[PDB]
Design a protein around this nucleic acid. Structure first.
Lengths: 165, 97, 222, 161
RNA sequence: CAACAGCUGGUUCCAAUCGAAACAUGUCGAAGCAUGACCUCCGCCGAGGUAGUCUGUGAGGUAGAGCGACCGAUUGGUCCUGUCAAACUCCAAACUUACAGACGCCGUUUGACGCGGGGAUUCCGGUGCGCGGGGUAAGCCUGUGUACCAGGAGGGGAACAACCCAGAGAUAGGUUAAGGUCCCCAAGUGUGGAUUAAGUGUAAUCCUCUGAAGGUGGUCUCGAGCCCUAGACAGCCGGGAUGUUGGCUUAGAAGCAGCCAUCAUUUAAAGAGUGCGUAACAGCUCACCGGCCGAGGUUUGAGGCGCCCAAAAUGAUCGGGACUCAAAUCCACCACCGAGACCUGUCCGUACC
RNA sequence: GCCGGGCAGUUUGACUGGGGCGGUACGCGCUCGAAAAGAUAUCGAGCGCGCCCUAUGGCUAUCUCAGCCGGGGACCCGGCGAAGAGUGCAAGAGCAAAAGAUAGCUUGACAGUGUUCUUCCCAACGAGGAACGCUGACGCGAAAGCGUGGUCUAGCGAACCAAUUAGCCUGCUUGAUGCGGGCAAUUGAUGACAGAAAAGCUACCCUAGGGAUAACAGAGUCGUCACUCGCAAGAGCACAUAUCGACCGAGUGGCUUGCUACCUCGAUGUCGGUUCCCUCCAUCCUGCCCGUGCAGAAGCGGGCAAGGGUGAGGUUGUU
RNA sequence: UUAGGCGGCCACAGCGGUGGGGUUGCCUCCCGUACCCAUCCCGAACACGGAAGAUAAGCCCACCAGCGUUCCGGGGAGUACUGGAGUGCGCGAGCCUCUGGGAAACCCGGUUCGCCGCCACC
């Protein structure tokens, strides 16, 4: 924190586990919520979660913003309705100033060449319109799930659109 | 490291369908005197190969030395001399448009 | 087909006919009556039948000037099994003296011969009988020791055509002997293998085939 | 055919273009040259599309600019290059009436300026108007912009120099 | 002894033609050299040449995309289902590029293309844009393509190396470019229409012009849902039945924590109750009932102008004054101002005939 | 001959987000970076070579595996089985009647001399390397043909001097002997790898220069720091919003810190203190207010507001 | 070629599947090891010799589309992206217009169960 020089893509690939080790584990609980198995897809009421932005939310971003989300999805009696889906994973690894590579801004260090930033965190990135994490059930209430994501958004760097079913 | 097989990656490589040995016909075909021939390296070859830089440009064949034909880009290198060194096999393709 | 992600190699391939990576082998030595896209003194094997062909390739063609295939023998000669070596010495020997010098044999054509002083006349050839040639490719097959494939080569060798090959990678004789060992030159067929199966209990006759060969080297019809 | 006038100057860009402004002729601003629509043409103009105005002038809108700015291999007298100073009344460079007839053959196709009555490009236009579109080159015609085509869009521009 | 230095400083008349390099290889080399690239001069040669485009014949695996195509990542379930790649690829551009023909342009008195030779300077670069790699970032470091500054005037931008117009002989008249037309200041207090009330704004780009995930039934414009002449809103006005506190549960549970039931009566109508509320009652409300004239009403999304989230150090600011049916903003439009550019007279230089 | 800073002359490298320490990106090879031709940087990412092999070379002939199943984790029989079991070593690429395996034979890992490409794109430059010839002599094959080492790209080293290989040239009037000088070539090192024989201290210092390059201050920046706003999970007996308030998102300031290596090295006087002036908020008190989990009293939180006020001492140079 | 050999392009040819064909002309399967030759053990294979018997494999011929592949119509889509231009919009990120190009996924419907060359041959 804060996430600033973290989620703007001004770099290019990898993740690559070959290349990198010492990746921190994600603190993003399972990306399968609600009752799985049965096809939730048969449902009235629909979806949400549209990013409306560019990218790279960190696992710190998604994992408390998503279960936060689920927490107020609990209202629908624990195990009784909806499945929650998350889309993208936090693959993508980021490195931060370890003074040896270059100079100035991050992904630059001291000297020239040298320490790339040391591994510290991972974040998935997204596009202008992608569905961050969706799923629904019949209109349980007015739309508790719609209330969900109200809270879900408001912990994402992006401005997420609710998007109607 | 540095060497003939320098950064090539795709240019040299021939993939899936055309893999293995190639037909003899190409490397057996003869060209005579000034005939414009393109240069390339068909992969799946291990001889009569030119460098890597300069591959893709046409040159004019000239006389043959040993089992290989003087050709290569007789043509100019960059905007420059037709300084030419040619040691290419028929294996690399000939013909003109 | 498939997703077509793969490309399939076939031509002659797919179902087998020719090989490749062989039959390319043959070809380089330009042999045949004349320059050949692919030339051979093919030897094929069939159950109860042996076939000898011979001919330069064409773009579409793979013609054959003269053929053998014991089956036709006996045109003259005799009724016996054709699935043995003897009777696969005869052919490939009968083809020789057909392909081997009749329609034309090794590179002999009207007009000036290929560059090199070379003149061919009847009777023993001047400047060496060496120029007569064909390469014999067993098709898909297995090279063995004295095998009929080779045997096909043996006659259809002393038939005038001169093919490269390796001696000691033949049956010797006996299985297919020469009548007299002191003189290599002779038309010789033997079928010793089967013979002496019994001693001479009855049945098989090696003696008959020497008979055939006698006829072969001589002025015969076709 | 087309008429080309280079509104934008070559401050420095682009280099491949500017090369193909010249070769047309027109090494200046507001100059104008007639181009035949053909391959080995059309490619060049498309390349220099942002630079210049473009289009079919109407004839009798091309006569207007021939008479005012016209020709001569060497700029000199008979400056007006009117009909008289066009097709040879007597011996001389000729073609047709030496007027609209000239910009009749030209509009359809050949002949070219230099080919007949061998006085060559370019037109040297004055560049006036109340103004040209909105000042500064922009996206194109459908926006304030002199860019692109229109028969009677290059008529006005061609007019009033 | 006028030591030597690859280091700092200095090196004195006019004009005309051309016009760089801040890069590559080697170097006890990185504050220096040499050799190439590149600049210039001279001699030779002799007819073609190729900065642009088109077509033809070839080269290519970046963008994108995809992986029931390799590969390696990466969910869940009882085949369905959820995701990815600088060092993945069944695919695959734009585009860059060899060669040729064509058009163009150029060259044969201005001799190109090219060959040989003399003289260099130069090897601290920089900025914009596009593509980048590193870095939290930088008026950062380091590449690449290109145009510019350096070494480029002049017009504009308040000022201002590289942003816009524009590439410049002298002198003169004329018309435009960028930009601008309320004043300062040349030209409009221009036209048709709409938004804005915040002085928002009057700020292209940017170290530079902040503003991200305070308020306004001021006014204008646009959209969506529902309700209306079987009479809506007010829609507005007034009212908010008996068994009974239904049974259970509970400390309580009385329409309204929760579970079960949801009948019946008296009715014009009124649920074993829609929400607020109480400890539970009470109370308010609907839901529900009555009345009332007559035409739209209500809910909500968006935008325009104005009005009254967002903290900094000597005196506030769009260049300033000041401006609001604008001198702001958006959509259209008319007429003007305004360079050395473009046009035009004369002259000068240079090249060529 | 040995000892021998007692004394003399010298050297003690370069790169490098200043220098030093660390490291070498100081010679070389592969993938990516690299923007689909070529070329392309950083103390850029991943990782290798400075050998090994007489076969692990050369040619020719002949040419079924992992694994699973069934029948008697060794082995034997059968079946399934395009390849998950090779090619010395990084990486990428090549290869199936083979370049891989097995067997046999063989020494082309030969001598001599070229052409060309590479090294060094374009575009000059050595050693080195490679491709492709020829001359001579061989090997294997029926033959075409293959073999100029190991499928391809790393595995390398000048001049001088010595040793070594074969023949020849030559040494001052002349012959003989001895011992020399030379033409062609092989081996021996310079890895700071296009090649010097080479350790440090200086605060006793000195010179030449540099803001081409650090310390201090900086105008730009605002990651850091300070403060605010949006959303409001949650907590506060019940109650988000008396009060406390995470995650995430948006900002403002220019007091801290860092960056710029942009400014100054022909010099912008250090820290702390002091004295004397002005300012900032975003208000600590005082005035006037709103809310309260406000009975009162005492508080807590918020609003307007900068008129005035907001100190003395002990340790420590201290801030 | 009422069945062959050598190929070119190298899935439009692949995967899977149905039907038909010969017996003395072909290809095989097949029969059999005296010989040339052969299995680290097996005439399995390789090699040789041969026709008692078959079409059942293979092969050749006709055909099917479920999978894979190729191309095409229509839709997606003139969308995504993009070369050139703009005193067009937006605080900004970014968007828009003009001009010249122009995709992928997927869906529905067709196409594809090879095409071609030489030679030999009832």
């Amino acid at each position: 924190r804060p996430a600033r020089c973290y989620r703007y893509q001004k770099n290019k690939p990898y993740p690559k586990s070959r290349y990198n080790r010492a990746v921190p584990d994600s603190k993003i609980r399972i990306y399968d919520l609600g009752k799985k198995k049965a096809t939730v897809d048969e449902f009235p009421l629909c979806v949400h979660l549209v990013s409306n932005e560019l990218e790279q939310l960190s696992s710190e971003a998604l994992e408390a913003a998503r279960i936060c989300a689920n927490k107020y999805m609990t209202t629908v009696s624990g195990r009784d309705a909806f499945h929650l889906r998350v889309r993208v994973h936090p693959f993508h690894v980021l490195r931060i100033n370890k003074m040896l590579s270059c100079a100035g801004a991050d992904r630059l260090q001291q000297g020239m060449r040298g320490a790339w930033g040391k591994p510290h965190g991972l974040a998935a990135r997204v596009d202008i319109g992608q569905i961050i994490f969706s799923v629904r059930t019949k209109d349980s209430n007015k739309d508790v799930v719609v209330e969900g994501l109200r809270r879900a958004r408001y912990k994402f760097p992006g401005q997420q659109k609710i998007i109607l079913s | 490291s540095h060497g003939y097989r320098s950064r090539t990656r795709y240019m040299f490589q021939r993939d899936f369908r055309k893999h293995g040995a190639v037909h003899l016909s190409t490397y057996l075909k003869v060209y005579k005197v000034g005939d414009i021939v393109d240069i390339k390296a068909n992969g799946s070859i291990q001889k009569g190969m030119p460098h890597k830089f300069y591959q893709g440009k046409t040159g004019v064949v000239y006389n043959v030395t040993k089992s290989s034909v003087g050709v290569i880009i007789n043509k100019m290198v960059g905007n420059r001399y037709l300084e030419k060194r040619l040691n290419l096999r028929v294996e690399h393709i000939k013909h003109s448009k | 087909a498939y997703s077509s992600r793969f490309q399939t190699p076939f031509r002659r391939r797919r179902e087998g006919k020719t090989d490749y990576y062989q039959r390319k082998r043959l070809v380089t030595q330009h042999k045949a009556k004349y320059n050949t896209p692919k030339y051979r003194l093919v030897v094929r094997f069939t159950n109860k039948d042996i076939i000898c062909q011979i001919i330069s390739s064409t773009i579409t063609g793979d013609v054959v000037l003269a053929a053998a295939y014991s089956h036709e023998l006996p045109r003259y000669g005799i009724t016996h099994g054709l699935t043995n070596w003897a009777a696969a010495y005869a052919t490939g020997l009968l083809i020789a003296r057909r392909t081997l010098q009749r329609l034309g044999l090794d590179e002999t054509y009207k007009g000036v011969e290929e560059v090199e002083g070379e003149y061919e006349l009847t009777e023993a050839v001047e400047d060496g009988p060496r120029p007569f040639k064909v390469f014999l490719d067993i098709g898909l097959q297995r090279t063995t020791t004295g095998a009929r494939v080779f045997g096909a080569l043996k006659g259809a060798s002393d038939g005038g055509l001169y093919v490269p090959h390796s001696e000691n990678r033949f049956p010797g004789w006996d299985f297919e002997t020469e009548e007299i060992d002191p003189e290599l030159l002779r038309s010789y067929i033997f079928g010793g293998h089967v013979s002496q199966y019994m001693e001479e209990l009855a049945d098989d006759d090696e003696e008959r085939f020497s008979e055939l060969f006698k006829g072969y080297l001589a002025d015969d019809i076709d | 055919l087309v008429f080309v006038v280079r509104i934008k100057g070559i401050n420095k860009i682009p280099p491949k273009p500017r090369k193909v402004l010249q070769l047309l002729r027109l090494t200046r601003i507001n100059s104008g040259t007639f181009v035949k629509v053909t391959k080995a043409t059309l490619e060049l103009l498309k390349l220099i599309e942002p630079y210049v105005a473009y289009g079919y002038p109407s004839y009798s809108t091309i006569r207007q600019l021939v008479y005012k700015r016209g020709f001569g291999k060497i700029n000199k007298q008979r400056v007006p290059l009117s009909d008289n100073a066009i097709i040879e009344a007597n011996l001389g460079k000729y073609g047709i009436l030496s007027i609209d007839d000239l910009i009749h053959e030209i509009i359809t196709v050949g002949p070219h300026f230099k080919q007949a009555n061998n006085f060559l490009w370019p037109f040297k236009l004055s560049n006036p108007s109340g103004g040209w579109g909105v000042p500064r080159k922009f996206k194109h015609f459908i926006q304030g912009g002199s860019f692109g085509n229109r028969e009677e869009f290059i008529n006005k521009l061609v007019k009033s120099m």
